[PDB]
Structures are given as structure tokens and as C-alpha cells.
Ligand binder design. Structure first.
Ligand SMILES: Nc1ccn([C@@H]2O[C@H](COP(=O)(O)OP(=O)(O)OP(=O)(O)O)[C@@H](O)[C@H]2O)c(=O)n1
Ligand SMILES: Nc1ccn([C@@H]2O[C@H](COP(=O)(O)OP(=O)(O)OP(=O)(O)O)[C@@H](O)[C@H]2O)c(=O)n1
Ligand SMILES: Nc1ccn([C@@H]2O[C@H](COP(=O)(O)OP(=O)(O)OP(=O)(O)O)[C@@H](O)[C@H]2O)c(=O)n1
Ligand SMILES: Nc1ccn([C@@H]2O[C@H](COP(=O)(O)OP(=O)(O)OP(=O)(O)O)[C@@H](O)[C@H]2O)c(=O)n1
Ligand SMILES: [Mg+2]
Ligand SMILES: [Mg+2]
Lengths: 559, 372, 186
């Protein structure tokens, strides 16, 4: 086993999550079975209690574990599947050892937070890094730990102590620390004193740093690096600069130009880890897929405009997984992406009574879009705008994907505007009216990776061509409310055909509309399973249809 | 896009530790501080939120006091040091409230002054602008007093020398372009000698093309060297500050081992007509700050005094020459003291007020504003 | 936006009247002539549409011969004056076809010469540039032979005189600025 801990910061907004998700990617190019752990200093047990307004979207794992965003960034960069244990939190570990007290397992000793709770952290990291994460049950070679918060805090405090002991309870040369740090620029001069005042605290809290990964606004001066290597004890080759480049998928290749694999190969003796040619050649092939997709980003010019239609579009992190899946689908089509933020409530005609500028800008963005996405919203208060965009996408022939709530407004749209029931309703919203035309029903939660089976006649469905025509699809779910299955025999007659269903047959999970270029609902969330080299099939479908050449993508899949 | 108050909270921890307790928290953010940013700094530092002053950039540094005055800082310091208990006369207090109105007036004049004046600052090391910080600041005072907005033209003097045409023509043209564009010219008391021929050519230009001129320290000395080479007709005449062990007879300077600090300059008797003496209020003695090892060779003065280069001011012994003004030019002055250092934001240094007035036009109207 | 061939058709009427008969109709339009504009000029003048040459602006006046050569004007004049019947030696003809390649070369050199040279032309009446037409044209020949693109800096000489500083400082600075900027002086 080996560990690399990514850590530090003068400030908590500094962006450690790319250097974690990008260090682990570079180590996966050596062919190593890499894994990752997030530490979050917040008290939440797991993210399911905190709304998407409050620091971004509610992620989903194979377990159903509603979790921190930063798990998702490692899953999509590293190709790995994570579990709800990979998110260490102050909530979890304190709830764990305090529940263990009432169980009695410390034999009625004191449960001081030094010794015993820092021992539970060091045990948890050693459990979790041995859980398998790739397509086979082989245990990881290297674990990347992202230490949330900063080193020099009061929510960080048990973790930085636990990791001082863990620098020895796992031997040095099986552990390395990467310290992210701030180097401000003021009046044209690079200021390395915030960094030198977090190297003092790092040595004090007891870890010793290996890298000094500065988030400067610039290239670091040769004299700036020379002084950081005088005040921190690292050699000047190790003072990596992580400055902005044309997209975040380039960041691994900047770190590779900055020798970071050659340093980590030495500093963790990675030549002593046992690897097969099936490991190593997969490693060096994955490097060439990353060099190819970044070269394709560097000279892709032909734009594709996708309208993302929903509430809270000013909080873009409320959709981080939706955005990132369109970026993967974009780079695979070799069309450059623009996403058009349509704040759905502005499409509703009553907006014309409040501000006409909003009513025109939103319908302008929607009309300009080469493809349309209803992105699995939350709450109900924007729903009429999401219905109008689904009417537009059906009648104007524009490519369409409905995710989760998106499948459900598509059924509501089709009921109101093709089946001809204008009172038909989201039972998710208009409940205590008790009306008969209910497009949905509550069936109290359903979460995690679940099996979707294709219905028998489905051969013609573009969505089934995009899934490689395989009879079952494994994808991640969230929904309380599902389509009322007593309308399905009507929709099945009117050309709205339910391509895929749950294994009991009673629950509807995919539809495709007959006789449209690409119009799909998926009631699972296709966002979360997308990887940077394997875009999620419904999202690859949307960005292909909007680019043209949907047929040529269907060959690239099925060959 | 987020304001980060953790560098500040990691210097309030150290402040309390080293044992002083803070009163104000004067942030140098790129922005206005958010009301929520101030509220959190007032939660982690113990100051109340009214005291978390923001010191962001404004149209010139002479506005900064009035931003701090909008941010209650006199009302806070009057309380927190009990300044009402200090004994003051009306001659103190009314000078206080009058000086405030001079600062409100000169900042209002900066806010709507538009008519530019371009001053060429001609010397070595112009990429190191802090090597001239007092020179720049004195021109800003003189500017705001004339009510003309300032541009200073940085002429890296060695580029004016014809040999630059053999090395890079772009430098030779840009430097002579900036010098030719200037409404007034300044030789700013340089250091060392290696740019001196460019400073002589700018002094030739300023004499023959009639452009307003001030030579400070070395500037007076290159003006004497220029005048010797180009009006008296000794082309071998030299800075003894540079060309020493040649031992030549036409020495424009001599070493006399240092001379520093505030010294008395007395005007020579006939001086009544001199614009520089009008700018000093016609007062018989001037007190100003000096630095020079080398001074004009006093055995050339009787020639220059005959040719219209008249030494308006001298040291109290008579033997040392400290000011000249050239007869029959709109404004052409050497001062061998440094006039920069004595300028105040409400009292610009008289030779520098002369230069920025001559370059603006209305040098006569400034001479009334002084002498009334 | 419409090309108006009635001023032309009202000078073809007068031409026939005063008694000469035209061969070419060399229009100074602001544009390329439309194919329908040429077809109507060839309906009202008696020339065939190939002969309605257009003489529009191009990157320098030394290109104009080669526009007329693209517009068949040697092939037309060789026919319409029977120039094959004029006696020529190879010392005539090969000097002819060599001079054509010197003109194709110097126009190709103008098409991709970029490195500027600034010459100050210092004198009175510079607002009347035709008062110096031969001076300007000789610098253009010298320019194209050096393969540097020309800018001429018009210095109205009286502005360099120090008394101008008493009348308008802007003139005194602009003129000395142009003179100081010049790579050469005339
Ligand atoms: N490979 C990555 C990593 C991060 N991000 C972006 O980074 C964001 C949030 O910043 P991040 O780098 O994850 O760190 P912070 O949120 O600043 O938090 P911390 O520094 O506490 O880790 C999101 O907007 C996400 O789009 C990204 O686009 N690609
Ligand atoms: N740990 C340190 C670093 C510097 N100094 C002193 O503080 C002075 C001012 O600090 P500065 O020169 O700004 O050093 P930097 O570390 O570069 O600060 P910054 O990065 O903000 O420019 C230095 O000349 C030095 O004498 C000090 O006392 N202790
Ligand atoms: N002295 C402090 C301040 C904050 N925190 C914790 O650290 C987390 C991340 O710090 P941050 O939210 O960034 O707080 P700020 O002080 O604003 O940091 P910055 O100014 O850099 O944004 C906070 O949510 C809080 O729980 C802490 O442990 N000790
Ligand atoms: N010699 C001519 C030419 C034209 N017409 C008539 O005048 C009308 C208007 O002239 P116009 O159409 O403008 O013909 P042009 O010669 O093209 O005029 P211009 O070039 O100015 O457009 C024509 O429709 C035609 O019936 C005429 O009487 N005598
Ligand atoms: Mg914060
Ligand atoms: Mg993060």
C-alpha cells in the first residue's frame, strides 16, 4: 500500500480537488490500481440532508450514499467506483466513535480524542483504501487522500493529528504529502509569505511536506521558486505551479511537464509495486487517450449549443455532474461546447407580465439551442417552463434529453399536448386536489445503482443503439415519484414507447419518442456514471444529435 | 469571485500572540468589502464592524484621506484616544478645518482637471520609477496647483545619444519622439555618469527649441556643460565628475568630500528680473536641501555671466553657484540643490511649480497667485 | 446599391455625335461591374461585353496594367490594330516579355513587402501633395526596389521653426515628432 495526501492551503477556496483528481490520474498512467478518499471537516453524516443551493448538487454512489461533490471528480477522472465510506467526515467519525462508546468497545476507558479517535481515523483510512474500486476485485496500489478544510484550523484538528501518527503507523516511503498553497500577486510582485505561514503551521501540526503546489495568478518566477525552496525544505524542482489552462482536463499534463510522476515514482519507490503488462500497457494506453482527447480539445472549433432548462441556474454547482457529462460528450463528438442557461420560470407566459426582457432572453436562448436538456431538477416551482421547453423540443424536432424530473415533465407535456388532458398534473406538486389524471405516483425513496431491462420490441430505439444493444443497463437512481404506470398503455399506443423498465416490469425507466431525430427520457440519473474517456450514453446521444452525425457515433460505439 | 478573510484571521491570531491588541482592520482587498465579509472579520477579530476600514484604489492617492473620512476614521480616533481632552487653540482648530477645505478643494480640482501637460523626465534607470519617487510627487503637487492633469514622459537618456542609432533605431526614435512631444523638460538629478550625453542633448534641445526646462542637481551641471560645448564653443569641455584623469583645462565642475542637508542660498544682487526669483516670492534667501560632491567650476562663471547664463543664487561665501536662469527664454532654470524634497501637497516646490506652470502656459498668472 | 450606366450612355451619344466611334468602355465604378451592367453597356454602346473594361482601385497604381491584362486588353488591342503585322526583332520581343516579368516581379514584391521605412518630406504647402507628385513617385520606385513598404511623413516645414511655439504648440510638437520618427529625411 502507498498514500499521497493532498492538503494545506492558506485559504479553503484554493482548489485542491483538481490536484487530487489529477495526481491520481497521473499515477493511473503508471498502470497502478489507484483509489481516493475525501476528508470533509463538516459535521454532516452524508450530503442527503443539505439542499443543492448550499454548496452544490446532491451526488449519488452505487450504495445509494448521497455524498460530497468531490467523490464525483475522482470517479470521473480515475474511472473508479466509490462507496459511501470513502467520504470521511467530522460527522461520521465522531458519530462512529461516540456510538461505539454506548456499545462499550473501549472497555470502559476514557475515550480521549487523542489516542482513541485519531486511532479510529487511522483504522478507517486503512480499511477504506483496501476496498476494491475497479472492474475486478483487486485491492488498490496507491490511495490519494484529499484533506478538506485547511491544515491550521479547528475542524481539521483530529485529522492533522491522525495523519501525523499515520506518517509512521504506515512507514515513510509509503506516505507523501502534497501541500497546496497561496502565492498572492500585489503591485506586480509574487508574495510567498502566506505560503511560508502555512509551512510553519504544517511542521508545527507535525506532517512534513513533499510538494508545494502554488495557486498563483501567473507562472512562478525562478527567484520565487528559489525562495519557497529556501523557506520550505523541498528542492526547487518540486515547487509545482498549477496555473489556469484552456480546460481542467489539461491539468494532469501540466503536472506531467512539471516532473510530478518522475518525482512520485522516486519518493514512493513505485518501481517496487508489482505490475503486470496488462496493468502497465493499460496505463500507457490511457495516457495516449488523455493526450488524444486534450489534443482534440486544442483544435475542436465547431460549436454545439445545448440548452440546460431548469431552476437555480445561477447556482451552476447545483448541476456540476450535468455540466461535466456534457463536456465528456462534447470532446467525444469533437464539437466545442456552449451550454445555454435557461432559468425555466422565465419561459412561462406570466413572466411577460413581470419582465418582458426575461421572457425574450430565455426563449431566445432556448430557440438558439442545437439540443435541449431537462436536467433532473429539485422542488417544483419552475415546472411550467420545463413543460414548455418539452413542447418546443417535441414539435420543433430539436434533440432532447429528460433526466429524472425531465422524463416526468416529458410525460406531463405529452399528456397535456398530445393525449389531450390539459388538467393532467405532477402528483409531485398538485397532490391534495385528488384529481384522476395523475401523471406520477409516490412509490418513500429509491437510491443507488439499479438494473434497467429493455422492453422486448426496443430494437429500433436510438437509446438502445447507444447502450450497445445490451439487454440490461446499470445506472444510478434517485426518485420518490415515478410515472403512473396506468397511463403507459396509452403512451405505448401514441408512439411514446417505454424502451426500458425495472426488473418487476411495473416501473418505467426509459422512453424514446417514435419518429423524432433524438427525444429521450431517462428516470435514472445518467450524469454520475460518465467518465472522462467514457461519456454517459444518453448524454453522448444528445451532444451527437445536436452536432449532427448521430449515426457515425452509433458506429463508433458498436464497432 | 469570493473574498477570502483567512490570511487576515491568521495575522490577528499572531497579533494577539505577540501581544498588541488591534483597533482597526484596514483591508487591502481588490474590491469593496461585502457586508458579510466585514461581519465575519468583526466575528474573528474583536473590532466592531464599523471599524473594518476598506482602503481600495481611487483616482489618485491624494483621495485616500477622504475615503477614510467617509469611513468614520476621525470620529473613531476622536473617541478611542479621547482627542477632545487634548488642549487646542482656535489658531490650531481653524487651521485644521481650513486645511481640510484645502484638501477637499485640491481633490475636487483633480476630479475635473482635463487639460494635459506632458513633462519629459530625462535620465538613467527610468524603469526603476521609485529611483525618482520625490521628483514624480513634486510634479504631481505642481500639476494640481496649475489645474492641469499630468503625463510624465520617461526618456531613458542614453537612447537620445546618436550611437543608439547603431544599436536600435526604435529606441532612438521613441526617446526623441517623447522628448519632442513634451510641453516641458526635466533633468532630474541623476546618479553615476553613464547616461550624461543624452542629458546634454536634451539640454541643447531645451535651450534652442525654447521648451521649458528645469535642471536639478546634475541637471544644473549638464546645463553648464551643454552651454559650454554649444554656446561658449569649447567642444572638449567636460564633466570632471566623469572625465577626471585626463587632467584637461576646460573643467565645467570641481570636487569640493560631501555637502548635505538644508542650506542657505542667497540671491545675487541684479536678480530682480529672474522668473525663479519671482517664484520664490522675491525673498532674498532660500532654504532648501542639498546633495553634491561636484559643483560648477567657479572660474567659468564670469564667462557665463557675460553670455546671458546668469547665476541668480549662490552660497553665503559667494564662491559656490546654486541657481542659474538663462536670459531671454520662457523658463530655463538650473538648481544645484534638490527642490523635490521640500514640496508639500499644499505648497509645491517653487522651481517645480515654475516648470509645470510654464509648460501649462499662464506662468504669469502663477506669479500673481504667489505674490498676492 | 444600384450601378447607374446612364452618365456613360449620355457620353456615348455625344461621342458618336462628335464623330469618333469608341472601342473600349473603361468604367471608373466604385465596384466590380455586374454581369448585367456590362450586358446593358454593351447593348447601348456597340462594343461586345468582353471590351467593357473595369478599372477599379487595387493595392497600388503599379498593379493597374496587370488588371487590364487579366481583362484581355493586350489580346483585344493585338487584334483591333493588327499588331502582328508590325515588324519586331527578337531584341524587341524578348525585351518586351522580360519587362513584363520585371513588372510581375515588382508587383509581387509590393504584395508581400511589410517592413516599413518612414521618410520625412520637409517643405511648404504639404497639403498640396500634387505640388510634389514626382518626389513622391520617385520614393515609391526606390521603396519597391529596396523591398521596404513606404510611409512618407509630411512635415510642413514652417512648424519646425521655434516661433510656432508662440502660435500653436501642437503644430510645433507634431512636426518635430514626425521629423524625429523618420528613418530618413528629404
Ligand atoms: N478537475 C476539476 C476539479 C475542480 N473543478 C471545478 O472546481 C470547483 C470547485 O473548486 P474545487 O477545485 O473543487 O475546490 P474548492 O471548491 O475551492 O474547495 P477546496 O479548496 O476546499 O478543496 C467546481 O466549480 C468544478 O467545476 C473542475 O472543473 N475540474
Ligand atoms: N520569515 C521571514 C521572512 C522575511 N523576513 C524579513 O521581512 C522582510 C520583509 O519580508 P519580505 O521581504 O516581504 O519577504 P517575503 O517572504 O517575500 O514576503 P512576501 O512574499 O509577502 O513578499 C524581509 O526583507 C526579511 O528581512 C522575516 O523577518 N522573516
Ligand atoms: N478559524 C477557523 C475558521 C473556519 N474554520 C472552518 O473551516 C471551514 C473552511 O474555512 P472557510 O469556510 O473557508 O472560512 P474562512 O475563514 O472564510 O476562509 P476564507 O476566508 O479563506 O474563505 C469553515 O467552514 C469552518 O468550519 C475553522 O476550522 N477555523
Ligand atoms: N436611353 C434610354 C434608356 C432607358 N430609357 C427608359 O427609361 C427608363 C428609366 O431608365 P433606367 O431604367 O434607369 O435605365 P438606365 O439606363 O439603367 O439608367 P441608370 O443607369 O441611371 O439606372 C427605362 O426603364 C427605359 O424604359 C429611355 O427612355 N431611354
Ligand atoms: Mg469560507
Ligand atoms: Mg473542493
Amino acid at each position: 500500500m502507498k498514500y499521497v495526501v493532498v492538503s494545506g492551503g492558506v485559504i479553503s477556496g484554493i482548489g485542491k480537488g483538481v490536484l487530487a483528481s489529477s495526481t491520481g490520474m497521473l499515477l493511473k498512467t503508471l498502470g497502478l490500481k489507484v483509489t481516493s478518499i475525501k476528508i470533509d471537516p463538516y459535521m454532516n453524516i452524508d450530503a442527503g440532508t443539505m439542499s443543492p443551493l448550499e454548496h452544490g448538487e446532491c451526488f449519488v454512489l452505487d450504495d445509494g450514499g448521497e455524498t460530497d461533490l468531490d467523490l464525483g471528480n475522482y470517479e470521473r477522472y480515475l474511472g473508479i467506483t466509490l462507496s459511501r465510506d470513502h467520504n470521511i467526515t467530522t460527522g461520521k467519525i465522531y458519530s462512529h466513535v461516540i456510538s461505539r462508546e454506548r456499545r462499550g468497545d473501549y472497555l470502559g476507558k476514557t475515550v480521549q480524542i487523542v489516542p482513541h479517535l485519531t486511532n479510529a481515523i487511522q483504522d478507517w483510512i486503512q480499511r477504506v483504501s483496501k476496498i476494491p474500486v475497479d472492474d475486478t476485485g483487486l485491492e488498490p496500489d496507491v490511495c490519494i487522500i484529499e484533506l478538506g478544510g485547511t491544515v491550521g484550523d479547528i475542524e481539521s484538528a483530529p485529522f492533522v493529528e491522525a495523519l501525523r501518527q499515520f506518517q509512521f503507523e504506515v512507514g515513510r516511503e509509503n506516505f507523501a504529502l502534497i501541500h497546496v498553497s497561496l502565492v498572492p500577486v500585489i503591485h506586480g510582485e509574487q508574495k510567498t509569505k502566506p505560503t511560508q505561514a502555512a509551512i510553519k503551521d504544517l511542521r508545527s501540526l507535525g506532517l512534513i511536506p513533499d510538494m508545494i503546489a502554488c495557486r498563483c495568478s501567473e507562472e512562478l518566477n525562478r527567484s520565487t521558486i528559489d525562495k519557497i525552496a529556501m523557506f520550505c525544505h523541498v528542492g526547487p524542482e518540486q515547487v509545482v505551479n498549477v496555473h489556469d489552462v484552456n480546460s481542467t482536463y489539461h491539468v494532469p499534463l501540466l503536472l506531467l511537464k512539471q516532473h510530478m510522476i518522475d518525482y512520485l515514482h522516486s519518493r514512493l519507490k513505485l518501481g517496487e509495486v508489482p505490475l503486470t503488462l496488462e496493468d502497465k500497457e493499460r496505463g500507457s494506453q490511457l495516457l495516449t487517450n488523455w493526450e488524444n482527447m486534450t489534443k482534440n480539445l486544442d483544435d475542436s472549433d465547431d460549436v454545439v449549443k445545448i440548452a440546460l432548462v431548469g431552476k437555480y441556474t445561477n447556482l451552476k454547482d447545483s448541476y456540476l455532474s450535468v455540466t461535466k457529462s456534457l463536456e465528456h460528450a462534447s470532446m467525444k463528438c469533437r464539437r466545442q461546447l456552449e451550454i445555454l442557461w435557461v432559468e425555466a420560470s422565465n419561459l412561462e407566459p406570466e413572466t411577460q407580465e413581470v419582465d418582458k426582457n426575461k421572457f425574450h432572453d430565455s426563449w431566445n436562448k432556448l430557440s438558439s439551442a442545437d439540443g435541449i436538456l431537462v436536467p433532473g431538477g429539485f422542488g417544483t416551482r419552475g415546472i411550467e417552463g420545463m413543460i414548455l421547453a418539452a413542447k418546443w423540443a417535441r414539435e420543433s424536432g430539436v434533440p432532447f434529453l429528460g433526466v429524472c424530473l425531465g422524463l416526468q415533465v416529458a410525460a406531463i407535456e405529452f399528456a397535456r399536448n398530445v393525449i389531450g388532458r390539459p388538467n393532467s398534473s405532477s402528483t409531485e406538486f398538485l397532490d391534495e386536489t385528488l384529481l384522476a389524471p395523475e401523471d406520477q405516483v409516490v412509490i418513500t425513496m429509491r437510491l443507488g445503482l439499479r438494473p434497467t431491462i429493455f422492453q422486448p420490441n426496443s430494437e429500433w430505439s436510438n437509446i438502445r443503439k447507444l447502450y450497445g444493444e445490451v439487454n440490461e443497463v446499470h445506472e444510478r437512481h434517485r426518485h420518490r415519484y415515478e410515472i403512473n404506470p396506468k397511463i403507459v398503455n396509452d403512451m405505448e399506443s401514441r408512439g411514446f414507447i417505454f424502451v426500458g423498465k425495472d426488473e418487476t416490469g411495473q416501473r418505467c425507466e426509459i422512453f424514446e419518442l417514435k419518429g423524432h431525430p433524438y427525444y429521450v427520457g431517462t428516470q435514472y440519473h445518467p450524469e454520475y456514471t460518465s467518465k472522462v474517456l467514457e461519456p454517459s450514453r444518453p448524454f453522448w446521444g444528445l451532444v451527437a444529435a445536436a452536432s449532427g452525425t448521430l449515426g457515425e457515433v452509433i458506429k463508433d460505439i458498436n464497432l
